[PDB]
Amino acid sequence: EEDASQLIFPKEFETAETLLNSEVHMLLEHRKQQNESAEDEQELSEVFMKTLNYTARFSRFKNRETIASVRSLLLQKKLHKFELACLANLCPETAEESKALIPSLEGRFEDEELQQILDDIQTKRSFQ
Amino acid sequence: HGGCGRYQPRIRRSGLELYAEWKKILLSPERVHEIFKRIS
Amino acid sequence: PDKKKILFFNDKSCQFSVDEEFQKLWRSVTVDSMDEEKIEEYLKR
Amino acid sequence: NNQLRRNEQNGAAAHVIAEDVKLLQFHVATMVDNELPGLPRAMQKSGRPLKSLKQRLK
Amino acid sequence: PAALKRLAKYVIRGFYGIEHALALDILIRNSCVKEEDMLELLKFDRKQLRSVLNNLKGDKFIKCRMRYFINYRTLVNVVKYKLDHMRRRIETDERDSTNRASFKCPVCSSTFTDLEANQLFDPMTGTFRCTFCHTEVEEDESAMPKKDARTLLARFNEQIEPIYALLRETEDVNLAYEI
Amino acid sequence: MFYHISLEHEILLHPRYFGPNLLNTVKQKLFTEVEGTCTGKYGFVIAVTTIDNIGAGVIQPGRGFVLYPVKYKAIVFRPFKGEVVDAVVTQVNKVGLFTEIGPMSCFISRHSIPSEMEFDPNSNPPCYKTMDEDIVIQQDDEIRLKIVGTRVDKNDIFAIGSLMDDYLGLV
Ligand SMILES: [Zn+2]
Incomplete structure (x- = not known):
C-alpha cells in the first residue's frame, strides 16, 4: 500500500529533508574524524562501515561545489524535492528513460527539459 | 428533512422475543441490525 | 405425506440444477429486510 | 451451532429453525446472566444452577 | 405477461x-x-x-x-437479487491471491513466504532451507487451491447461463414488452 | 531515500552515574543503543549529529531509575516501493539475482530479469548474460534496479526488484 510510485509517504515525511550518496559520504569520514579524537571509546558499529564501504565505492558526483551547484540547479525549478533526490542517484541520459524511471513525470514539462538537466548533469559529471 | 409517511408499531417484549403491532410482527435480530446499520 | 396423499403428474422438456444456487438460496435469506433492489442496480452500474 | 449450520445448509422446513433459534438465543443468554426473572434456569449437577459471568463477579 | x-x-x-x-x-x-x-x-x-x-x-x-x-x-x-449477490460471492472465491508459492517444509509442514525462505535461502546449497529444521522447503502444496476453484467456478457458474439463456432472454424481451 | 529528520528517545539511568559529569554520561549512552540498530517504522538509523535538549529527569516511584527525555536530529534511510536504485550483486542463482543496497538486502526474481540476460551456472562465477555476451552480470557487479516492494523486520530491511524496466542494468 505504501508506494513511492503512487507517491504515498507517511505524514511524518514533511520535514524529511533528503540527501544523496555524496553528502552521506562526506560526513561518514567526519564520524571517522570523530573516532580520531575523543579517545577512551570502544570500536565502531557494523552498519557504519558496511554502508560506508558500499556508498564510497560508488559516488554520484565528485566534490562539494559539484553538489552545492546542483542543489542550486534544481532550486528555481517547480519541483517536489522528492524528485531531485531520485535522479540525483540515477544518472540517466535519455529523457524517456527518466520518464520510464519515474511513473510520475509524464505530463509535467517538455521531454527535453529534464533531458537538458540530464544534459546539465552529464555536462557537470566528470566521467573517467 | 427525512421523507416517509408510514406508521410505527407498538413494540412489546416477551421473554426473549419482541413483538410489534401498529399485524403483530416479532422482530428479528438481523432486521433490527440492518436498521441500526444505517444510522448516521 | 410419507405414503398417504399422491399426485402422479407429468411435465418436462429439460432444465438446469445449480450447486451454487443451493448455496445462494441459503445466502439470500433476508426475507423482510428492505433496501436491496437499489443495491443490485448500484453494483451493476 | 454445528447442527444448525447443516440444517439450514440444506434448506430445512423453516419451522425447526424457529424452535432452535430460540434454543441458541437461550443458550447464549444463559452464559452471561442467569438471574433474570422468568427464563427457566439451566442445570448440570445435583440441582446446580449455572454460575454465569455476571454471577462470577458478585 | x-x-x-x-x-x-x-x-x-x-x-x-x-x-x-x-x-x-x-x-x-x-x-x-x-x-x-x-x-x-x-x-x-x-x-x-x-x-x-x-x-x-x-x-x-x-x-x-x-x-x-x-x-x-x-x-x-429478486431474479437479479439472487444474481448480484451470488456473482459477488463466486467472484470472491474466484479472485485468487497470487502465485503465492511460499516455501513449505515437508517434514514439519510449516508454511513460509517466498520472503520467509529468502532470509533462510542457504547460499551453500543454492536452495531454501526451513527455519528450525534444515530440511529443504516445497510448494504451498494443497493449502488453498483458490486458483483451481477460480477455474472450476468459472466453468461451472458461467456454464449454466446457456441453459438459462432461454429465460435470461425471455425475461429481457418480456420486460421490454411490459414497458 | 536518505532523509534528515528529527525524532526523540528516553534513557533510563542507573543511580550509580549521578554526580559530576552526569550530563555527558547521557550522551555516550545515547549514541550506542540508538544508532547502528535499525528499526522498522522509521527506516534505518545510520548516524546522529546533534542533540537538541535533555528534558527533566523524572524519578519514578521505587526501582531507583530516573528517566530523562532527549531530542536529537539523526540522518535516516528509509526506501520506498517503486524507488529506483543502484545496487551491488552479492550472489547469483538460477531463481534470480541477489543484490544489496548498503546494509539492506535485495532479491531480483529471474522472471523479473529480461530474457536476453540468461542465467549461466556454467561459468565459475554464476552470472546473467546476453547470448552475444555483450554484458555478463555476475557477483559484485554494480546494477540499477527498481524496488517492487520493501520489508522491515526487527532491525533488518529487505526489498525486491526487477530489471525488466527500461534503463536498467550495469552502472
Ligand atoms: Zn521443517
Whole structure:
C-alpha cells in the first residue's frame, strides 16, 4: 500500500529533508574524524562501515561545489524535492528513460527539459 | 428533512422475543441490525 | 405425506440444477429486510 | 451451532429453525446472566444452577 | 405477461423442486387461487401446503389477497437479487491471491513466504532451507487451491447461463414488452 | 531515500552515574543503543549529529531509575516501493539475482530479469548474460534496479526488484 510510485509517504515525511550518496559520504569520514579524537571509546558499529564501504565505492558526483551547484540547479525549478533526490542517484541520459524511471513525470514539462538537466548533469559529471 | 409517511408499531417484549403491532410482527435480530446499520 | 396423499403428474422438456444456487438460496435469506433492489442496480452500474 | 449450520445448509422446513433459534438465543443468554426473572434456569449437577459471568463477579 | 409466466416456466425448471413446482404450476393462472381449492386440487397435506405457501410468502412470490378466502400473485424481482449477490460471492472465491508459492517444509509442514525462505535461502546449497529444521522447503502444496476453484467456478457458474439463456432472454424481451 | 529528520528517545539511568559529569554520561549512552540498530517504522538509523535538549529527569516511584527525555536530529534511510536504485550483486542463482543496497538486502526474481540476460551456472562465477555476451552480470557487479516492494523486520530491511524496466542494468 505504501508506494513511492503512487507517491504515498507517511505524514511524518514533511520535514524529511533528503540527501544523496555524496553528502552521506562526506560526513561518514567526519564520524571517522570523530573516532580520531575523543579517545577512551570502544570500536565502531557494523552498519557504519558496511554502508560506508558500499556508498564510497560508488559516488554520484565528485566534490562539494559539484553538489552545492546542483542543489542550486534544481532550486528555481517547480519541483517536489522528492524528485531531485531520485535522479540525483540515477544518472540517466535519455529523457524517456527518466520518464520510464519515474511513473510520475509524464505530463509535467517538455521531454527535453529534464533531458537538458540530464544534459546539465552529464555536462557537470566528470566521467573517467 | 427525512421523507416517509408510514406508521410505527407498538413494540412489546416477551421473554426473549419482541413483538410489534401498529399485524403483530416479532422482530428479528438481523432486521433490527440492518436498521441500526444505517444510522448516521 | 410419507405414503398417504399422491399426485402422479407429468411435465418436462429439460432444465438446469445449480450447486451454487443451493448455496445462494441459503445466502439470500433476508426475507423482510428492505433496501436491496437499489443495491443490485448500484453494483451493476 | 454445528447442527444448525447443516440444517439450514440444506434448506430445512423453516419451522425447526424457529424452535432452535430460540434454543441458541437461550443458550447464549444463559452464559452471561442467569438471574433474570422468568427464563427457566439451566442445570448440570445435583440441582446446580449455572454460575454465569455476571454471577462470577458478585 | 404470457412470457412473464415463461421466465417462470424456466425458473421453476431451473430452481424449485417437484413439491414446490407442482404448486408453482397452479400459480401459473393468476385469475383466482383460493386456499381450500389449492389444497383439494394439489392433493397435498394441509400443514405441508401451509409450509410451501409460507415459503412462497417468504419469496413474496404471492400477494395474499384476503376476502377468509385467499388469492396469490407474483412478486419476485429478486431474479437479479439472487444474481448480484451470488456473482459477488463466486467472484470472491474466484479472485485468487497470487502465485503465492511460499516455501513449505515437508517434514514439519510449516508454511513460509517466498520472503520467509529468502532470509533462510542457504547460499551453500543454492536452495531454501526451513527455519528450525534444515530440511529443504516445497510448494504451498494443497493449502488453498483458490486458483483451481477460480477455474472450476468459472466453468461451472458461467456454464449454466446457456441453459438459462432461454429465460435470461425471455425475461429481457418480456420486460421490454411490459414497458 | 536518505532523509534528515528529527525524532526523540528516553534513557533510563542507573543511580550509580549521578554526580559530576552526569550530563555527558547521557550522551555516550545515547549514541550506542540508538544508532547502528535499525528499526522498522522509521527506516534505518545510520548516524546522529546533534542533540537538541535533555528534558527533566523524572524519578519514578521505587526501582531507583530516573528517566530523562532527549531530542536529537539523526540522518535516516528509509526506501520506498517503486524507488529506483543502484545496487551491488552479492550472489547469483538460477531463481534470480541477489543484490544489496548498503546494509539492506535485495532479491531480483529471474522472471523479473529480461530474457536476453540468461542465467549461466556454467561459468565459475554464476552470472546473467546476453547470448552475444555483450554484458555478463555476475557477483559484485554494480546494477540499477527498481524496488517492487520493501520489508522491515526487527532491525533488518529487505526489498525486491526487477530489471525488466527500461534503463536498467550495469552502472
Ligand atoms: Zn521443517
